Amino acid sequence: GAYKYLEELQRKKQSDVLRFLQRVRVWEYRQKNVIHRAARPTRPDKARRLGYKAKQGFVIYRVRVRRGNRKRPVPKGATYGKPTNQGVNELKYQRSLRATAEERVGRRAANLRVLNSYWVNQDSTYKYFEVILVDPQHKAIRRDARYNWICDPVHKHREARGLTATGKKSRGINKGHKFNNTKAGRRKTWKRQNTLSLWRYRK
Amino acid sequence: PEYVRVQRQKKILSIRLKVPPTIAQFQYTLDRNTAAETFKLFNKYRPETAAEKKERLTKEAAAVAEGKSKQDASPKPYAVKYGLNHVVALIENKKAKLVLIANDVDPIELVVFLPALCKKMGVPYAIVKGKARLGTLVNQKTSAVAALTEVRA
Amino acid sequence: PSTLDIEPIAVKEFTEIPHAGKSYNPNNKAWSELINKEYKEEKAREDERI
Amino acid sequence: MRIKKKNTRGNARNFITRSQAVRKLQVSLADFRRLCIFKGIYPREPRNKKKANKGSTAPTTFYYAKDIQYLMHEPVLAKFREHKTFARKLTRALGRGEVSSAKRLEENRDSYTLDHIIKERYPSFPDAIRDIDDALNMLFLFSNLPSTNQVSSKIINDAQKICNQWLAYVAKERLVRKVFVSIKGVYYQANIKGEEVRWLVPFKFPENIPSDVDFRIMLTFLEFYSTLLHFVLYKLYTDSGLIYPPKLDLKKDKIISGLSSYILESRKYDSPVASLFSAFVFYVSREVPIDILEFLILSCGGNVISEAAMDQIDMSKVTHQIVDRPVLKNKVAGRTYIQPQWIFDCINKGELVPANKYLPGEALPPHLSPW
Amino acid sequence: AGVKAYELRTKSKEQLASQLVDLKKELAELKVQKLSRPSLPKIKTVRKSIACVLTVINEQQREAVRQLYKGKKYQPKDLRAKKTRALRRALTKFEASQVTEKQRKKQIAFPQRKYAIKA
RNA sequence: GUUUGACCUCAAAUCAGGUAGGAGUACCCGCUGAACUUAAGCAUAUCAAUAAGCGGAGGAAAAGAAACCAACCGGGAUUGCCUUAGUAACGGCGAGUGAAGCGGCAAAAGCUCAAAUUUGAAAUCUGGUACCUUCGGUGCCCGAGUUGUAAUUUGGAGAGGG
RNA sequence: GUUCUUUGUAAAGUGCCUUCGAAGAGUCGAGUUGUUUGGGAAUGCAGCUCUAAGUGGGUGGUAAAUUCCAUCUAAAGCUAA
RNA sequence: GAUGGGGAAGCUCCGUUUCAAAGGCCUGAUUUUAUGCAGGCCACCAUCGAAAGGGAAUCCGGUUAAGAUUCCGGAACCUGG
Questions:
Q1: Protein-covered nucleotides on strand G (Cβ within 7 A)
Q2: Nearest to A35 by CA among A57, A66, A56
Q3: CB D343: neighbour CB atoms within 10 A?
Q4: What CA–CA distance (Å, rounded) separates A198 from B129?
Q5: Does one domain contain both E18 and E56?
Q6: Distance in angstroms, CA of D2 to C1' of H74?
Q7: I need a surface site. Which of B101, D8, D71, E16 has the fewest CB within 10 A?
Q8: Do A144 and E98 touch (CB under 8 A)?
Q9: Which of the 34-93 residues on chain B come under 7 Å of nucleic strand F at their beta carbon?
């Protein structure tokens, strides 16, 4: 079907066709509110590969967030400390902006459980996204065991904990020696390596 | 209301901005006479309504309960193909004889490649105005496409 | 509500009983009486119009 | 407390503009007028227009706001909203080209029933008989007018059926007690469990429609009166044990479509008005009306035959022959002859006045009307 | 010494209302007798009988509402189970038992076999 | 036809059925986040990727069945302990910081979607109504869904045809 | 332990020959800057720019080019101990 | 100091009409489509915020161990219906 056609056309963002469609879409979104529910996804193949069905209880939420480095929340930029605090405006906001958009759409739709999100547009002042969502309360999701896993309380607010794939990327969770600092949680491995074990029979 | 001015400015931007040739091939729609003829032809092969489908199900069940040749007693089906992925799959096979394409699909990217793939495979195609007119014969709110893999002699 | 129980306020008089002068060759007494009364009712408007 | 804002209580609260009622009901004033015709709500005149209208002198109508509050709970408004949604659904089915879906939707619906309104509005069934006079009058009026637009003639057929049923019941029970012919029609009166019930029967002649009247309100009143008279005839038939609705021979309807249709049958006489002209077998000339006269002789128990029945098809037992021709054809010496008027005075009195009177061409007494 | 609830259960609702009005009048009289007396231990009993009659009338109305609502969905929220807020959000046993046809065929094809290692 | 309906979008509902706020917060998942102290009085470094503040669930949480570890006769979900090791390594090579493979043990489970024309039948499903054997089942009626709901396949494999 | 019924015209598995084997894009990757790591030529995270291919891509603890080999298939997801 | 919105990872900040679809009045057989609301007018903002700011209205006599223009006698005045 259209799967691979749209999957390849999305890759040609520099093509004049996507070049004009992206401008029309960024303008239509700039006319719209920073947070609003898109009636349908603009990239059906992307949501389809992100696990979204087209059935009741699923939801899509277009979102907008300002680009730029984090500014430290202190008056006049005061250091109140050692000089080495270079670049008070240079803070990079360790969490990815997509994670912030997911947290915003989840705060707007806290009854819904965030699952995944994908880039759809961006501008100089914003980076647009279209986070998908599902309602655990809907009977269609509670049935069809393939999608019922979200109903578990542990899955609540997955975006806030970083369980979303953007959050898993920001956390560094990946196999390999390169991720040894955060292969299983940075704070967890730090507390484990720093522990002073003391058996009743000292070694 | 802000949504009204938003859609109006969107149409004004679509009219004012230059468009790549692959877009704007829509609005070169088939003439109303040939379009009405194509719809008068497609109307004969509308997909079966769910009530008629349940009637055929009861008929085949009564036939299997007493008769022979299970599921074969019914005549061959004859209905326009309408599924978008199914329509694209019918092309490059190639059982499709014609492929209608709505000009007003909300995601323009979904159908921009359809005319090009049809020109590559050589299957006849046309861009009828209005997805709703294609969906009315389909017994659905919208179908965005229509095709005829088979027809009565 | 009790307000429904009360009858609608009365308006111009009406009676189910037909007048005796519309009685299939009405007797000359009541017939002439009804004719005189309708003639007076018409003559009043005719005088006002004149 | 604090100043009570004069234009907040009293007549301003007890009374409200009819447009305000249509807005509170949000029913577009049409279903509102229909329910008001059904619920019995009527316009009311405030004793002080300045208070009810916030001092305006305009002749604004007022409808006893609490009565409209009682109207808000009426299920029939919900049924009207359901019919409004069904109309849009039928429009969608017709615009989509799926006519079979429109037929399936038309099959899956039922008209609203007024019987609950007939029960809440008329407790003590004889009290329902007290208002019957308007119902029989409106039904006999609508039955006679030629079918026309906004009628569809089905209402005329139901009215003619209910009228024939009421006439057959009045004939089988011999409830007639007085008659009064008039230029506007043949007036009638009959007891109903001892209650009097006057009613008028329009002459069976074509009549022009002024079109100046609001026909829709007359149709709603006819529907209400039809439901009321239907419940009344059902109770009257169950009380007598007669099967209802009465069966009818279709061949009799194709001949004259007269009172003979809808023969009554079970699942002394009033003495004198009942069983009048007992054992008599009257005959009637074509020129005299057949329906208005045959119903009276049948309610009196006399047999009736008409020359009009001979147009399509015995006279071996006739004891009388009504005639009104200016010069009657030579009469049989053994058969009595009399003008139609003789039956009317005989019903008005019951004394069986001598046959020598009312003999054609001799002039009849003017009316000797009972009233 | 005071009304017995099992005796009250047999009474009709009007009888329970009359007994409640009588106990209320007796309590209103004992309230004056208490200020007229150094102590009124007896007042403690009638106030408990009033609460007993009220609880009996409440149980009667509750069982009646449970009877009229029996056998239909969406019972009144006060009658709904009060296990805990978390359990109401927990999936129903029919939902937890749901399985896709693929996993069902995979389970029917190779159910966990029983075995032991002796010979 | 100077009329209607359909599609798309957006609003009103004290509309029918639902969900989130909060508290607790020892443990967990993330953000933000200092200095006292130590190296001469230090601006790299140490304190510390800590204290405080903030958001999110549980009885555990996260992670979890590799774009792994290894260069060997190669092992093979994640997690915890011993050892690797106070070693490789980092650090005005100063203070000080500082891991990971292999080996033994505790406990062992698999796998699921997108990417397939069913097209000889959208076979899927939310909701209302009536009934019953009521954590649900059946008939009927609206609706979601053809811009894609079920089965068929998740690379270990796997699909049309014989 | 027994007790009513089937599902068994329905569903699953194993061999050979044949043609097939789609598998994730503002992503990976690289430039610059902030933070952090034992990671040391820049381990991981993060802001801005550039930004692709499928006999392809990542990894092979010293930065590059050339001829090769060893192991997996990221940019989707659930799972008690 | 909310609401509609714009910031902020966030506890929460800005703003009080600012880029909001911010309801309350009249007519009616709206004349022909017959059981489908058709035709007209309007207009800024929630809320809190002074017991000395504006306010709708009571005067005398008598009375308690302690209350009064509030309690009793008399004669008054304002608001709504």
A1: 9, 11-13, 22-28, 33-39, 43-49, 51-53, 59, 61, 75-79
A2: A66
A3: 25
A4: 79
A5: yes
A6: 29
A7: D8
A8: yes
A9: 47-48, 50-51, 53-54, 56, 60, 71-77, 81-87, 89-90, 93
| Separation CA D346–CA B127 (nearest Å) | 87
Calpha distance D284→D304 (Å, rounded):
8
Is strand G in 7 Å reach of the CB of A69? Answer: yes
Out of B86, B88, B113, closest to residue A9 by CB: B113
Residues E25 and E48 in one domain: yes
| Domain at E116, CATH number | 6.10.250.3450
| Pairwise CA distance, residues D37 & D41, whole Å | 7
Query: Are E16 and E30 within one domain?
Result: yes
Packing angle of the helix pair D65-72, D18-25 (nearest 10 deg): 20
From E73, E88, E111, give the residue that closes a domain: E73
- What are the phi and psi torsion angles at A195 (to 5°)? -65, 140
C-beta of residue D190 within 8 angstroms of C-beta of residue D170: yes
User: Counting Cβ atoms within 10 Å, is residue A151 exposed (0-12), middle (13-18) or buried (19+)?
Assistant: buried
| Domains held by chain E: number | 2
CA–CA distance from B46 to each of B124, B126, B146 (Å)?
20, 19, 10
Tell whether E8 and E36 lie within a shared domain.
Answer: yes
CA E31 to mean position of chain CA atoms? 33
Among residues D208, D174, D189, D184, which one has the least CA distance to residue D136?
A: D189
Task: Give the separation between CA A104 and CA A95, rounded to whole angstroms.
Answer: 13
Structure's resolution in angstroms? 3.1
- Dihedral angle at the C-alpha atoms of D20, D24, D25, D27, nearest 10 degrees? 60
Could you say which DSSP state residue A69 is in?
P
CA angle D223, D78, C3 (to 5 degrees): 70
The identity of residue D175, as a single letter, is L
* D28 backbone dihedrals φ, ψ, rounded to 5°: 70, 20
Q: Cα–Cα distance between D1 and D19 in angstroms, integer?
A: 33
Going by the DSSP 8-state scheme, the letter that residue D334 receives in this structure is T
**Residues paired with residue A62 on neighbouring β-strands, in sequence order:** A36, A130
- Ordered by start, the domain boundaries in chain A are 1-203
Q: How far is residue D140's CA from residue D132's CA, in Å, rounded to a whole number?
A: 12
Residue with tokens 């021709």: D325
DSSP states along D213-255: S-HHHHHHHHHHHHHHHHHHHHHHHHHHTB-SSPP--HHHHTT
**E102 and E60 both lie in a single domain:** no
Give bridge partners of residue A60 from the DSSP assignment: A132
- CATH level 3 topology of A1-203: Ribosomal protein L15e (3.40.1120)
Q: Are strands D185-192 and D176-182 parallel, antiparallel or unpaired?
A: antiparallel
Given an 8 Å threshold on Cβ–Cβ distance, is E91 in contact with A151? yes
CA distance D200 to D189: 9
Residues E61 and E78 in one domain: no
E10 lies in the same domain as E51: yes
Clarify whether residues E5 and E52 are in a common domain: yes
Q: Domain range holding E62? A: 1-73
| Half-sphere CA count of D206, side-chain side, radius 13 A | 3
| Structural domains for chain B | 1-153 (3.30.1330.30)
> Are the C-beta atoms of residues D209 and D148 closer than 8 Å to each other?
yes
> Does the beta-carbon distance from A2 to B88 stay under 8 Å?
yes
